[PDB]
Short mmCIF file of C-alpha atoms (C1' of nucleotides) in Angstrom, two decimals:
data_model
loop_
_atom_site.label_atom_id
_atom_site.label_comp_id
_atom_site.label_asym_id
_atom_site.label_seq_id
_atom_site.Cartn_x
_atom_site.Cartn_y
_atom_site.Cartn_z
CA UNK A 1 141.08 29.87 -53.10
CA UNK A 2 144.89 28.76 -52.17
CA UNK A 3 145.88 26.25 -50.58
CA UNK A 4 146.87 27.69 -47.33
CA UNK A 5 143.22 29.36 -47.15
CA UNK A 6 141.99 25.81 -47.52
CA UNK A 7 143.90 24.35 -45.31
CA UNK A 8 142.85 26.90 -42.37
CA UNK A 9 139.58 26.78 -43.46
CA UNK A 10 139.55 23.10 -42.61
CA UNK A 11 140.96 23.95 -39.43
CA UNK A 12 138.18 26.70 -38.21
CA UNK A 13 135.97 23.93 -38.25
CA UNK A 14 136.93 21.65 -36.13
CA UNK A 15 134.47 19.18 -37.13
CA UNK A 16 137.54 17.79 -39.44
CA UNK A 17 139.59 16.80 -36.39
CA UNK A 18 139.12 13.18 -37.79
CA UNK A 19 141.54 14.48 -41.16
CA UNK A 20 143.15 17.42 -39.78
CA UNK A 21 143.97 19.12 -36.42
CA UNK A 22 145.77 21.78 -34.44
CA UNK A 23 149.15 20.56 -32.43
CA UNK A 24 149.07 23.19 -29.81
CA UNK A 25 149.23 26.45 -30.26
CA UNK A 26 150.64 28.37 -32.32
CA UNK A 27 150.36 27.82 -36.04
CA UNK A 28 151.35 23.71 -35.95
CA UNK A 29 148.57 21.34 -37.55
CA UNK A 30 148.87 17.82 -37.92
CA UNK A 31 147.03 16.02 -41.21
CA UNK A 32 145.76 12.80 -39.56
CA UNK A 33 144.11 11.59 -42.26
CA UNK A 34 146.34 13.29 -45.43
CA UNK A 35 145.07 11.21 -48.01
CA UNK A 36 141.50 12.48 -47.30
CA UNK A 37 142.78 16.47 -46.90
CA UNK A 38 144.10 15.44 -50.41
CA UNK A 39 140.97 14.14 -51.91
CA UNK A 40 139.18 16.70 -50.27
CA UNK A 41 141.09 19.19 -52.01
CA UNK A 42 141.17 18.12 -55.30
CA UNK A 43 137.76 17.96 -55.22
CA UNK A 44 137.91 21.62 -54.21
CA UNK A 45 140.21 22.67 -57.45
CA UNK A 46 138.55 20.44 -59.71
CA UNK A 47 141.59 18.00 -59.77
CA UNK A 48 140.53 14.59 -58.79
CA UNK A 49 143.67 13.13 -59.23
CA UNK A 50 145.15 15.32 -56.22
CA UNK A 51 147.40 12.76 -53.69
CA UNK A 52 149.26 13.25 -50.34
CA UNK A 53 152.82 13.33 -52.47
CA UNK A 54 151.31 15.74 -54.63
CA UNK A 55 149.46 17.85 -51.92
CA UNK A 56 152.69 18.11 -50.09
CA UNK A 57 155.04 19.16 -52.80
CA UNK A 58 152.58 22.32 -52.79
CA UNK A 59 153.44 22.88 -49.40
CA UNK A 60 157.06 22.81 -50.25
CA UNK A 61 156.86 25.57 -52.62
CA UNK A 62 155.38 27.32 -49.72
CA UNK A 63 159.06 27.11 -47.74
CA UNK A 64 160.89 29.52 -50.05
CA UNK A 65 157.85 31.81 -50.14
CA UNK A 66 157.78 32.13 -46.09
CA UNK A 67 154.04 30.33 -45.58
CA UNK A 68 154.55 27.53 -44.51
CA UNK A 69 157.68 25.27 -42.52
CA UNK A 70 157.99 21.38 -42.13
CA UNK A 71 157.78 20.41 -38.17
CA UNK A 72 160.88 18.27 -38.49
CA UNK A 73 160.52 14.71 -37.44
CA UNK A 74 156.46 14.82 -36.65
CA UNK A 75 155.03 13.05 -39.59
CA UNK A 76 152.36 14.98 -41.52
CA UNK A 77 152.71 17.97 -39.46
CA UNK A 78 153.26 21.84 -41.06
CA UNK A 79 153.61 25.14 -39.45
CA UNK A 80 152.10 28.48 -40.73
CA UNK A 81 154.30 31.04 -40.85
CA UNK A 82 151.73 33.56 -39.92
CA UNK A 83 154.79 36.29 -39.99
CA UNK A 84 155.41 35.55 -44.06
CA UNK A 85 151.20 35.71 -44.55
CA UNK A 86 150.61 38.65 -42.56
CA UNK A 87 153.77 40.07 -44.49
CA UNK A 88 151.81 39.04 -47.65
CA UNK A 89 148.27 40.45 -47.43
CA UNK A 90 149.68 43.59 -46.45
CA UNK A 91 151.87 44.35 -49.09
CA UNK A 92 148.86 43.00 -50.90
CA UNK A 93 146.70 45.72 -49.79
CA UNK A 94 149.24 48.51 -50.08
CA UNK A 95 150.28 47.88 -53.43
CA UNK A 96 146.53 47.57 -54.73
"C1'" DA B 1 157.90 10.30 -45.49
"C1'" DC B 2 160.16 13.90 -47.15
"C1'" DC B 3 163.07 16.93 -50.41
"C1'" DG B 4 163.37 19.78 -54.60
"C1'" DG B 5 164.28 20.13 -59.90
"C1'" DA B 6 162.03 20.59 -63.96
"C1'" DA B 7 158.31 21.18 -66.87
"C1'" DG B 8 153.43 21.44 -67.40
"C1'" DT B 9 148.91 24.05 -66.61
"C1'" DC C 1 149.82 31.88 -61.77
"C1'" DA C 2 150.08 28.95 -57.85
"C1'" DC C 3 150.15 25.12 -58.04
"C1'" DT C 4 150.32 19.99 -60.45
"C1'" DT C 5 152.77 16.37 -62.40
"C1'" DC C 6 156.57 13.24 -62.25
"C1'" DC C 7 160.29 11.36 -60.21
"C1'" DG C 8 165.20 10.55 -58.67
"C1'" DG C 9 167.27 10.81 -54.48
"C1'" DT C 10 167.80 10.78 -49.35
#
DNA sequence: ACCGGAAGT
DNA sequence: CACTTCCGGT
């Protein structure tokens, strides 16, 4: 699983609007608890010393590679770049 | 908090 | 590999 999987799978469920939510539509979500979407996902990759700063600096190797933008100024808040993904798993698919 | 280089896995 | 680790810098 990657991390943007993860982090949508979180969001389908919106059971974990106490850690993570939405910010209208379309593709902005705000961590409001990021230290437990950290833990949460270390404990997912088997790396239990997963933090915020570390979680994040994953997401900013996601700006280059067209997943994922900063919401500028909103703190703890990401966009998808649903564009770049779709881009992704199709070339995915057509390739093999 | 957030950026991003550099090196590790 | 797709992150993780660490950290100086803003």
């Amino acid at each position: 699983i990657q991390l943007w999987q993860f982090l949508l799978e979180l969001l389908s469920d919106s059971s974990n609007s106490s850690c993570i939510t939405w910010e209208g539509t379309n593709g902005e979500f705000k961590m409001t608890d990021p230290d437990e979407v950290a833990r949460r996902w270390g404990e997912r990759k088997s790396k239990p010393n997963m933090n915020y700063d570390k979680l994040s600096r994953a997401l900013r190797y996601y700006y280059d590679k067209n997943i994922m933008t900063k919401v500028h100024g909103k703190r703890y808040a990401y966009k998808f770049d649903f564009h770049g993904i779709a881009q992704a798993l199709l070339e995915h698919h057509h390739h093999h």
